[PDB]
Amino acid sequence: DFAELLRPLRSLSFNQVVDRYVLIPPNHTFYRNWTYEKFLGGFGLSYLILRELPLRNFYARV
Amino acid sequence: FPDRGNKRRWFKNLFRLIKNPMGYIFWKTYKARLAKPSLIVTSMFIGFTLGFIKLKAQSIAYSKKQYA
Amino acid sequence: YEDFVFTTPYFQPESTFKSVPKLFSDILLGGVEWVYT
Amino acid sequence: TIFAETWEASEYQYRNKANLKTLPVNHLGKLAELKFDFVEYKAHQLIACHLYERMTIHCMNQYGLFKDFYRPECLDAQYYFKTCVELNAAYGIQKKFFPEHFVGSPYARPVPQFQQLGL
Amino acid sequence: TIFAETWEASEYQYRNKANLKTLPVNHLGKLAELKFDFVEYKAHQLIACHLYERMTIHCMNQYGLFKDFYRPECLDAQYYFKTCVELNAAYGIQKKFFPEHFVGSPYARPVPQFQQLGL
Amino acid sequence: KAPGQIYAYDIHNTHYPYVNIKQDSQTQLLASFRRSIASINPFSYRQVPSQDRAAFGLRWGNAWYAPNPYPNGIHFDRVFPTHYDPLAETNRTKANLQLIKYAPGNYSTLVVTSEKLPRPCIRTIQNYRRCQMVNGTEKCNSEAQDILAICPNWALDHMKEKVRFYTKALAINNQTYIRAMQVEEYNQGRTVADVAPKTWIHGTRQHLRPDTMWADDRYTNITQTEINEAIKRVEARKAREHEKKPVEQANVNANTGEQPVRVEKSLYP
Numbered sequence: 001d002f003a004e005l006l007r008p009l010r011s012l013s014f015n016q017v018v019d020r021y022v023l024i025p026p027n028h029t030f031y032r033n034w035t036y037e038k039f040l041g042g043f044g045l046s047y048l049i050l051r052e053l054p055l056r057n058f059y060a061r062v
Numbered sequence: 063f064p065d066r067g068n069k070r071r072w073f074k075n076l077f078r079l080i081k082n083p084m085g086y087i088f089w090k091t092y093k094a095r096l097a098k099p100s101l102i103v104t105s106m107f108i109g110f111t112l113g114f115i116k117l118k119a120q121s122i123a124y125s126k127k128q129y130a
Numbered sequence: 131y132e133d134f135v136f137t138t139p140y141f142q143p144e145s146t147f148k149s150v151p152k153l154f155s156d157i158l159l160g161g162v163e164w165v166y167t
Numbered sequence: 168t169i170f171a172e173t174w175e176a177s178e179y180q181y182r183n184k185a186n187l188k189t190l191p192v193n194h195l196g197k198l199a200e201l202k203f204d205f206v207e208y209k210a211h212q213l214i215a216c217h218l219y220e221r222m223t224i225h226c227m228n229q230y231g232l233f234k235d236f237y238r239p240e241c242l243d244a245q246y247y248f249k250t251c252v253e254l255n256a257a258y259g260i261q262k263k264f265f266p267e268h269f270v271g272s273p274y275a276r277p278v279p280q281f282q283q284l285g286l
Numbered sequence: 287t288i289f290a291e292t293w294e295a296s297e298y299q300y301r302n303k304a305n306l307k308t309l310p311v312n313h314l315g316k317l318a319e320l321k322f323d324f325v326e327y328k329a330h331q332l333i334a335c336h337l338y339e340r341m342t343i344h345c346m347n348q349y350g351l352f353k354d355f356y357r358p359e360c361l362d363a364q365y366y367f368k369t370c371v372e373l374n375a376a377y378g379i380q381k382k383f384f385p386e387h388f389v390g391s392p393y394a395r396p397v398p399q400f401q402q403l404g405l
Numbered sequence: 406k407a408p409g410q411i412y413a414y415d416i417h418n419t420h421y422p423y424v425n426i427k428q429d430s431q432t433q434l435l436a437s438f439r440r441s442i443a444s445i446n447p448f449s450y451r452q453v454p455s456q457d458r459a460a461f462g463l464r465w466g467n468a469w470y471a472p473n474p475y476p477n478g479i480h481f482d483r484v485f486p487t488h489y490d491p492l493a494e495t496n497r498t499k500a501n502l503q504l505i506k507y508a509p510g511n512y513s514t515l516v517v518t519s520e521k522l523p524r525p526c527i528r529t530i531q532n533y534r535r536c537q538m539v540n541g542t543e544k545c546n547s548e549a550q551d552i553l554a555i556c557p558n559w560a561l562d563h564m565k566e567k568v569r570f571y572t573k574a575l576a577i578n579n580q581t582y583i584r585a586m587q588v589e590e591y592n593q594g595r596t597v598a599d600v601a602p603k604t605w606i607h608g609t610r611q612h613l614r615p616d617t618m619w620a621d622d623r624y625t626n627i628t629q630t631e632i633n634e635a636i637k638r639v640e641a642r643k644a645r646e647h648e649k650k651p652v653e654q655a656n657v658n659a660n661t662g663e664q665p666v667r668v669e670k671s672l673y674p
């Protein structure tokens with residue numbers, strides 16, 4: 001398993017490793033925080049659907 | 063026997079307050095609000111309440127200064 | 131001295147006429163803190 | 168480098184600085200959290216940071232490094248081992264080049280020579 | 287000993303200690319509280335503690351020392367004169383044997399020689 | 406112009422490895438099902454970061470995972486002395502307001518740091534060093550005065566202390582040199598010619614037997630009769646070794662009203 005962690009490196013040279021994983025071209029235009037906005041924002045969207053539960057008893061929905 | 067009709071009454075009023083807080087507060091205070099004080103008294107209530115909340119926020123911000 | 135030994139290094143009398151020009155330095159009781167709110 | 172199994176807890180406490188960390192002995196209770204069977208000798212559990220390393224090897228032998236090693240008892244062993252050798256390397260260097268920072272050092276608060284008392 | 291009429295207030299403030307007292311100039315306003323007539327020259331009012339001394343003499347010449355000198359304007363003049371010469375004697379000795387305690391002294395926070403910087 | 410991927414992505418080949426540390430059947434079953442539908446699941450969250458999208462940490466049930474903070478005995482009591490022992494429990498109990506406050510830095514290590522001297526103070530040092538290597542030290546008084554004037558006094562105190570620390574560290578490294586380069590009594594007259602042609606492997610378990618009786622099968626054929634005969638021989642040698650015994654030394658820690666010496670503790674109570 002320690003040799004499996006280095007599997008994608010054995011097929012590459014050092015120059016290819018640096019260009020592949022180290023020298024990623026700079027691009028600061030992405031909305032990186034969309035991952036959190038989708039996750040935490042899902043609580044509000046889930047509430048919009050959940051506030052319509054056809055459970056007749058009020059205390060059941062409580 | 064006790065009055066079993068009053069069971070869990072504090073929970074039920076809590077959930078009704080969460081369901082519609084302004085509707086619960088409105089009707090629970092209707093007869094009391096029939097006597098309305100002057101504009102001065104009402105303004106002093108809001109002025110002193112928001113002033114106390116403003117100082118509370120400044121005390122919270124000072125606690126972050128002491129933590130730093 | 132009078133039945134007493136007080137060990138001190140060799141005193142330099144030339145240190146008396148040491149030109150020490152006074153420099154400005156003002157203390158402000160009531161100034162700036164590190165952080166503010 | 169500590170050349171024993173045990174060390175004085177106060178010898179690694181600061182004298183002129185606030186004490187916000189300790190250098191505790193190896194947490195032997197974490198060894199009983201491993202559910203699988205293993206052989207561990209008591210003669211290796213006291214030396215600093217080594218028990219956590221042997222636990223990590225036992226966990227990396229029973230399980231691998233993917234989706235089976237990621238269990239609370241095995242990740243804490245790897246985290247404690249990594250953290251232990253990092254603190255001990257820092258306290259060891261501070262013990263070598265800053266011996267006067269710790270309680271018990273004669274240079275933390277130097278006692279004067281008798282010639283300095285003027286008697 | 288101060289060899290002038292005026293002194294820098296900051297030179298008698300401590301640098302490494304809390305400043306709980308100052309060495310203020312003569313309180314010229316107390317000179318106007320004397321009800322009687324007297325002759326005072328402006329050339330004598332700035333030198334330290336001397337105005338309070340002359341006020342005491344003027345009060346002890348107009349009144350005596352019994353039941354007439356005991357008025358608020360005369361007792362404050364004698365108290366200020368006694369307190370002023372006590373504070374100045376203490377500050378004078380502290381200026382002579384502890385010059386490093388005050389703001390403006392080159393020994394309060396010594397600047398190192400260039401040979402100590404290792405460049 | 407595709408977004409860059411970190412090295413961890415090539416290990417897992419997916420951005421959605423549903424890794425949950427809580428080892429219960431309900432959690433791992435739901436994680437395996439969510440791991441399979443992550444391509445078409447709108448309720449999918451990344452745990453492998455990328456250049457274009459951030460990611461979440463390791464999950465613990467519905468909450469998030471973080472290892473137990475390394476055991477620390479420092480704490481602060483509120484109502485009564487709790488005698489907190491970080492080694493008495495597996496997981497650290499939460500700090501209640503009326504019970505305890507733990508030390509700062511749940512996840513923190515000890516490092517050495519340094520302040521950065523002001524830029525104008527740095528420029529004066531570069532000017533002095535440059536003027537020194539070109540014109541010599543004797544013609545750099547003005548540049549030396551600019552350092553004493555422009556650099557704030559705290560910076561000059563830091564510069565003064567660095568020289569004193571590195572003087573201390575120099576003496577410590579040289580005392581280690583003397584102890585290391587000291588020729589012991591068992592190496593008198595021995596040079597590199599007396600060294601054996603052995604490497605690190607020649608001192609390991611395969612070539613050098615450890616000092617334990619069951620490291621290998623060396624003593625597995627020893628019968629009880631040979632043991633009794635050995636006890637006789639080891640007692641015969643003791644007729645010459647037991648003749649001498651070191652003398653008992655005086656107790657330097659006799660007076661309990663005196664600061665005791667940190668003497669070597671006895672092996673056994």
Ligand SMILES: CCCCCCCCCCCCCCCCCC(=O)OC[C@H](COP(=O)([O-])OCC(O)COP(=O)([O-])OC[C@@H](COC(=O)CCCCCCCCCCCCCCCCC)OC(=O)CCCCCCCCCCCCCCCCC)OC(=O)CCCCCCCCCCCCCCCCC
Nearest residue numbers: 038039040041042043045046439442445446447448449450
């Ligand atoms: C045509 C006729 C019908 C034929 C088809 C019939 C079959 C239909 C099913 C197939 C089609 C489904 C379509 C979507 C495909 C999804 C495929 C999939 O794998 O999803 C698995 C999906 C996700 O699994 P998961 O990984 O475990 O994530 C849920 C975790 O809770 C997550 O927890 P977390 O903590 O890890 O993360 C928090 C989470 C937030 O999660 C939460 O907070 C929810 C927590 C639940 C409440 C807590 C109480 C839980 C109680 C436990 C027991 C629950 C049992 C419920 C069983 C429900 C069975 C479905 O936030 C997020 O991660 C991101 C959320 C934002 C996502 C963006 C929203 C896109 C949704 C799609 C939009 C378009 C659809 C139309 C609009 C919606 C309809 C009006 O499983 C679910 O279904 C979860 C329940 C969601 C409610 C579903 C209600 C919508 C149903 C729509 C039906 C059609 C509309 C009505 C039409 C009527 C006329 C026909």
Ligand SMILES: CCCCCCCCCCCCCCCCCC(=O)OC[C@H](COP(=O)([O-])OCC(O)COP(=O)([O-])OC[C@@H](COC(=O)CCCCCCCCCCCCCCCCC)OC(=O)CCCCCCCCCCCCCCCCC)OC(=O)CCCCCCCCCCCCCCCCC
Nearest residue numbers: 064065066067068069070071072073074075076077079080
């Ligand atoms: C060996 C292995 C196994 C070991 C097992 C160990 C466990 C032992 C199990 C056996 C224990 C139970 C024994 C049988 C009990 C039978 C008694 C009975 O007949 O029922 C009486 C009682 C009668 O209630 P009720 O007549 O319907 O109405 C109450 C009145 O009408 C009043 O209603 P109200 O509307 O006027 O409201 C007032 C009410 C409640 O109003 C309150 O002010 C209390 C509020 C507490 C909740 C909030 C706490 C604040 C923190 C959270 C904030 C919430 C905010 C929410 C909103 C969000 C923000 C706005 O005041 C009360 O205190 C009522 C509580 C029930 C009375 C009992 C005497 C209490 C006096 C001392 C009070 C102090 C303790 C209170 C504890 C919490 C009470 C819910 O029923 C029960 O409470 C049932 C409790 C027993 C359920 C057993 C469940 C199964 C047990 C096994 C589960 C596994 C446990 C694992 C534990 C693991 C170890 C940690």
Ligand SMILES: CCCCCCCCCCCCCCCCCC(=O)OC[C@H](COP(=O)([O-])OCC(O)COP(=O)([O-])OC[C@@H](COC(=O)CCCCCCCCCCCCCCCCC)OC(=O)CCCCCCCCCCCCCCCCC)OC(=O)CCCCCCCCCCCCCCCCC
Nearest residue numbers: 043044047050051052058061062077079080081082083087
């Ligand atoms: C005592 C002095 C100190 C007081 C301290 C302050 C107290 C807390 C204040 C907090 C303020 C939050 C503001 C919320 C905005 C609500 C706006 C609104 O119009 O309210 C209607 C709104 C209902 O409108 P709706 O959306 O159409 O829901 C009706 C559906 O039929 C619903 O369907 P259903 O009827 O079938 O369900 C049963 C019903 C009744 O059953 C229950 O509610 C009982 C269960 C309660 C569980 C315990 C709740 C713990 C706290 C909630 C969770 C943490 C906060 C989450 C974020 C809330 C803020 C938006 O549930 C509900 O009513 C709605 C569910 C409650 C929320 C449940 C989910 C919580 C998480 C939300 C996820 C979505 C947002 C993501 C998070 C955002 C983070 C960035 O009520 C609420 O949602 C909750 C009210 C919150 C305030 C309650 C306390 C207010 C009064 C406090 C005392 C006032 C003193 C000053 C007055 C002086 C008088 C003289």
Ligand SMILES: CCCCCCCCCCCCCCCCCC(=O)OC[C@H](COP(=O)([O-])OCC(O)COP(=O)([O-])OC[C@@H](COC(=O)CCCCCCCCCCCCCCCCC)OC(=O)CCCCCCCCCCCCCCCCC)OC(=O)CCCCCCCCCCCCCCCCC
Nearest residue numbers: 094096097098099100103104106107108109110111112114
């Ligand atoms: C989690 C947060 C925890 C901390 C906060 C906790 C907050 C708890 C308190 C909640 C609110 C108080 C509860 C009120 C009960 C329900 C309402 C009510 O009073 O029923 C109406 C009822 C009669 O009113 P009404 O039937 O409608 O007749 C009036 C007509 O409409 C026409 O009016 P009128 O022409 O006949 O007379 C003019 C007007 C007279 O003009 C006034 O209304 C006087 C008040 C003007 C504004 C005063 C400043 C605003 C105060 C709130 C803002 C906080 C200030 C910051 C505090 C900093 C220091 C903590 O009369 C009135 O309108 C009602 C005055 C009766 C006194 C009002 C109740 C006491 C003042 C409010 C308590 C403040 C406590 C909040 C802070 C607590 C912090 C621990 O009043 C009574 O219950 C009778 C009780 C005896 C009252 C007279 C003697 C009072 C002796 C105690 C004074 C305590 C002062 C505390 C000062 C705070 C510290 C500086």
Ligand SMILES: CCCCCCCCCCCCCCCCCC(=O)OC[C@H](COP(=O)([O-])OCC(O)COP(=O)([O-])OC[C@@H](COC(=O)CCCCCCCCCCCCCCCCC)OC(=O)CCCCCCCCCCCCCCCCC)OC(=O)CCCCCCCCCCCCCCCCC
Nearest residue numbers: 095096097098099100101102103104105106107108109110
């Ligand atoms: C040809 C004539 C010109 C045309 C006139 C047309 C006028 C149009 C009238 C329309 C009325 C407004 C309609 C909508 C509002 C109705 C709902 C309402 O809230 O009314 C209050 C309503 C009724 O009040 P009330 O307790 O029944 O008292 C009724 C009267 O005030 C009577 O109370 P009283 O019987 O106890 O009388 C004694 C009086 C005793 O007063 C005096 O004896 C003399 C007062 C002298 C004032 C001294 C000023 C000193 C200034 C020093 C400033 C120095 C700092 C400046 C620094 C500047 C920078 C350097 O003391 C007061 O009551 C003063 C009340 C507050 C006065 C504030 C404005 C004063 C100046 C108004 C100028 C308007 C033009 C007048 C032209 C005519 C001149 C002859 O109060 C409520 O309970 C409803 C809710 C109130 C919630 C409070 C917070 C609400 C905030 C928003 C309010 C609405 C938006 C703003 C609208 C204007 C409000 C001020």
Ligand SMILES: CCCCCCCC/C=C/CCCCCCCC(=O)OC[C@H](COP(=O)(O)OCCN)OC(=O)CCCCCCC/C=C/CCCCCCCC
Nearest residue numbers: 028029030031032033034035037038445446447456457458
């Ligand atoms: C949200 C309001 C919608 C209506 C808007 C009306 C007003 C119109 C005025 C808009 C002015 C536009 C100003 C510029 C906005 C810029 C938008 C932005 O910053 O985010 C874009 C950003 C681009 O991402 P990157 O590739 O990382 O960045 C590359 C940048 N070149 O978009 C995103 O991150 C995606 C999130 C955006 C919102 C997504 C909405 C999701 C709603 C879900 C409902 C759809 C149903 C889903 C069903 C799923 C079925 C499998």
